[PDB]
RNA sequence: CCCACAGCCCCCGCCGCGGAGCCGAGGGCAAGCUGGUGCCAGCAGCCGCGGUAAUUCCAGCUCGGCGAGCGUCGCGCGGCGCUGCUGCAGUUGAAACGCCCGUAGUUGGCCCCCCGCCGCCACGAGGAAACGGGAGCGCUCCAGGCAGGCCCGUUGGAC
RNA sequence: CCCGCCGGCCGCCCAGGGAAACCGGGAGGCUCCGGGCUCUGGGGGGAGUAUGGCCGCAAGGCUGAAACUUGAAGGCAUUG
């Protein structure tokens, strides 16, 4: 029936004490309930997409046991992206699990300018690199109007994250879709962890929360 | 035995589809303005 | 044998900064090292340092503040035409807004921004950001 | 490192690349000359010869013919693509023979076939297959 | 030899590297329908011109503002854009050029300028009348649908005096 | 009107033919229903189809791409960071000489503020255009060319 | 006896790295990819074969192709 918070953060979100998701991310608080985001994302601002569905088998005494692994990404096209996977005996159940996991884990994306500054940010802040398996990715900021120079799979992730200009290079076995998606996800995740001369400002900490 | 052993319905004499841009205009209304499931049996069942 | 002192110094600096230390010791001092450190200090990356005279390749001590992200050198010092700097900036630096490239010119050691200002070229030494 | 990097080392790098670029199979094939002398077509897109004998995990007999190139006098084997096209080919007849998709290597399940028939007696084989042209002159 | 050998010539369009792409096909068909494009070569031509402008703007922007060549070429490019009506009058900084889109190029075609004036019912009707030489620019009649009008010539477009 | 003469373009009168093909529909790669044949005939650049529903052969219907053009064969560049200066790899996938000495070759710590020479950077002189870039110009547009109106920078063909 | 320094031979191991097994006195400091020098390799066979050259009493060693053929051969690890 009604959603009953099972966590302290969940109860606080049930109340109006927390007003934005950046107030959660800035303290590295984990998210364990799908409601903690949908309450912050009620409208259909976000969007879900199925990337790849693969079947995996386990040999046994009499025949093989088959199952499906699924990958799903979600984003609002405004500095928010998520990626998850799920496995189950049924394709639909695997899709639901993957969607839930993608919703659960999410990170903000920092965006910047190429050379000139004017209007809202349109490309990644700087060069971002990611790694997963044998796959490495490079994201280089591009001028306005340059579009997204990337493969169809990576381009979908960039569009969901909300980036309109970027140059990409892929190395390794890129035909392994999950590893490429993970590499780009990690590169995007690293964005809010690189120190720049603009962030050198020394701010005193606040006791509240 | 004879080669080409493996090797007739009256042609549907219908007005030719328009040529040039008018053909392009046809598809625009075909996929959006006009109700479509592209190519399944049920769609072909309806058109008969 | 020892060849590039600056490379050793920069590698030691980055190694110390990685594990959040506060002071490093570099063994063979030299003028180029001192100018490199002066530029780094002027741009606000490594605070202050001191040189200890022993009559034999003086040592040097630097104090860090956890701002430096990466430093390195280009061993075969290539020549950079005054109009061929943006290619190297794109290839080497994370962005065109922040980061520095060090060149040695007939006018002395200077940042690539200054060289662009005076429309001159020279040889490349290193880079940091 | 594992590569020479001194400021006065252009000659060594040049000779290293010169020596080591010969290890690539494609580059050798293209710039060694043995392939040029061995290829019956002698670098041409297609050649002209004369028919001399009609012959034959998938188990499907294929129809082909033996050809003797006019300009070179050597013997090769060519394959007749379409269905029932062997009848259009008669013993001791002039044909135009081209290559397959792959330059040199065999295509498909056909063993040792690298040439294709495209024109017979001055009329396109595919055109004859669709009845566009006719062989009543022969 | 013949003097005709020294005449120049060049292509005017670029083909996509990946032909089959569903979003691209949808967008191209959409644009063709709105602007009544005869075929897909016009889109390639527009992309070519846009790429040329963008490359010029990039090369100029890579330099310092107080560079004589930068001032010269930027002034020339901005004057051309303003005269052709692709860029708005109030914009004078080189940055605004890089955000341009082919729709802006298309909107200055003769069919579009006569349709926005209410002189034609639709783009297709506009093309049909243009082919039948019933329109005039200034004192001259133009029968090329792709003819591009200039801002100072927009108000001088009318119906051909001799047209029936 | 033009033209050495004839065309052609363009202009003025009368009468008035509106004609689309080439490839494909299992995947790469956008596009699906009946009838034949039965590992035969055939398709298939690669994976593969065909031994009684053949989503792949042969035909009809329908559909997709480009379009006055489409397809096939060979070569070059790209793809390819699979020739790697930028920028590969060398424990086990291909690959560190059995070890030492050693010439040619390549590379060589730190130090003197102001002189000479070599490299280096910047500027300049001198030296064909055409091509390429690029300022200006409405050959009806365009590919193009160096023009045009009038009261023309000495009109211009700058660099 | 225990507290150290230099040199050498070993074991376990946080980071970090890697396809992983594993290394961590490096196989780390590297797509955020430039310390110096030398050697080797470019899908699997044909083949370390043929023909030449040098060496050796010989057995043999060093150097070392092409035509043609083929769609995979291999590494580490998981379930049976
Ligand atoms: Mg082995
Ligand atoms: Mg090995
Ligand atoms: Mg490297
Ligand atoms: Mg390799
Ligand atoms: Mg080999």
PDB file of N, CA, C and O (backbone and C1' of nucleotides) and ligand atoms in Angstrom, chain D residues 23 25 28, chain G residues 41-46, ligand 5:
ATOM      1  N   UNK D  23      57.340  -7.292 -42.594  1.00  0.00           N
ATOM      2  CA  UNK D  23      56.765  -8.432 -41.897  1.00  0.00           C
ATOM      3  C   UNK D  23      55.256  -8.524 -42.050  1.00  0.00           C
ATOM      4  O   UNK D  23      54.678  -9.559 -41.702  1.00  0.00           O
ATOM      5  N   UNK D  25      51.924  -9.197 -43.959  1.00  0.00           N
ATOM      6  CA  UNK D  25      51.608 -10.030 -45.114  1.00  0.00           C
ATOM      7  C   UNK D  25      51.058  -9.194 -46.265  1.00  0.00           C
ATOM      8  O   UNK D  25      51.468  -9.358 -47.421  1.00  0.00           O
ATOM      9  N   UNK D  28      53.778  -7.043 -47.996  1.00  0.00           N
ATOM     10  CA  UNK D  28      54.618  -7.894 -48.830  1.00  0.00           C
ATOM     11  C   UNK D  28      53.902  -8.250 -50.123  1.00  0.00           C
ATOM     12  O   UNK D  28      54.449  -8.089 -51.218  1.00  0.00           O
TER      13      UNK D  28
ATOM     14  P     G G  41      62.431 -11.168 -35.563  1.00  0.00           P
ATOM     15  O5'   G G  41      60.958 -11.036 -34.979  1.00  0.00           O
ATOM     16  C5'   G G  41      60.324 -12.134 -34.341  1.00  0.00           C
ATOM     17  C4'   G G  41      58.898 -11.812 -33.982  1.00  0.00           C
ATOM     18  C3'   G G  41      58.049 -11.248 -35.107  1.00  0.00           C
ATOM     19  O3'   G G  41      57.530 -12.267 -35.941  1.00  0.00           O
ATOM     20  C1'   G G  41      57.725  -9.980 -33.122  1.00  0.00           C
ATOM     21  P     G G  42      57.177 -11.962 -37.476  1.00  0.00           P
ATOM     22  O5'   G G  42      55.755 -11.259 -37.393  1.00  0.00           O
ATOM     23  C5'   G G  42      54.685 -11.893 -36.705  1.00  0.00           C
ATOM     24  C4'   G G  42      53.428 -11.064 -36.719  1.00  0.00           C
ATOM     25  C3'   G G  42      52.960 -10.624 -38.109  1.00  0.00           C
ATOM     26  O3'   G G  42      51.549 -10.783 -38.230  1.00  0.00           O
ATOM     27  C1'   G G  42      53.162  -8.744 -36.693  1.00  0.00           C
ATOM     28  P     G G  43      50.954 -11.854 -39.269  1.00  0.00           P
ATOM     29  O5'   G G  43      49.589 -12.320 -38.599  1.00  0.00           O
ATOM     30  C5'   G G  43      49.523 -12.597 -37.211  1.00  0.00           C
ATOM     31  C4'   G G  43      48.588 -13.737 -36.912  1.00  0.00           C
ATOM     32  C3'   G G  43      49.084 -15.125 -37.276  1.00  0.00           C
ATOM     33  O3'   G G  43      49.991 -15.656 -36.327  1.00  0.00           O
ATOM     34  C1'   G G  43      46.853 -14.867 -38.005  1.00  0.00           C
ATOM     35  P     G G  44      51.123 -16.699 -36.787  1.00  0.00           P
ATOM     36  O5'   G G  44      50.313 -18.038 -37.074  1.00  0.00           O
ATOM     37  C5'   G G  44      49.562 -18.665 -36.046  1.00  0.00           C
ATOM     38  C4'   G G  44      48.905 -19.928 -36.538  1.00  0.00           C
ATOM     39  C3'   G G  44      49.820 -20.914 -37.246  1.00  0.00           C
ATOM     40  O3'   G G  44      50.536 -21.734 -36.340  1.00  0.00           O
ATOM     41  C1'   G G  44      47.835 -20.614 -38.507  1.00  0.00           C
ATOM     42  P     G G  45      51.872 -22.484 -36.813  1.00  0.00           P
ATOM     43  O5'   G G  45      51.357 -23.501 -37.925  1.00  0.00           O
ATOM     44  C5'   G G  45      52.260 -24.101 -38.839  1.00  0.00           C
ATOM     45  C4'   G G  45      51.531 -24.716 -40.004  1.00  0.00           C
ATOM     46  C3'   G G  45      52.398 -25.210 -41.150  1.00  0.00           C
ATOM     47  O3'   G G  45      52.950 -26.491 -40.907  1.00  0.00           O
ATOM     48  C1'   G G  45      50.557 -23.977 -41.997  1.00  0.00           C
ATOM     49  P     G G  46      54.463 -26.805 -41.332  1.00  0.00           P
ATOM     50  O5'   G G  46      54.506 -26.450 -42.884  1.00  0.00           O
ATOM     51  C5'   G G  46      53.777 -27.216 -43.832  1.00  0.00           C
ATOM     52  C4'   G G  46      54.033 -26.739 -45.238  1.00  0.00           C
ATOM     53  C3'   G G  46      55.491 -26.476 -45.589  1.00  0.00           C
ATOM     54  O3'   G G  46      56.188 -27.649 -45.964  1.00  0.00           O
ATOM     55  C1'   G G  46      54.174 -24.632 -46.259  1.00  0.00           C
TER      56        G G  46
HETATM   57 MG1  LIG H   5      52.365 -15.309 -39.580  1.00  0.00          MG
END
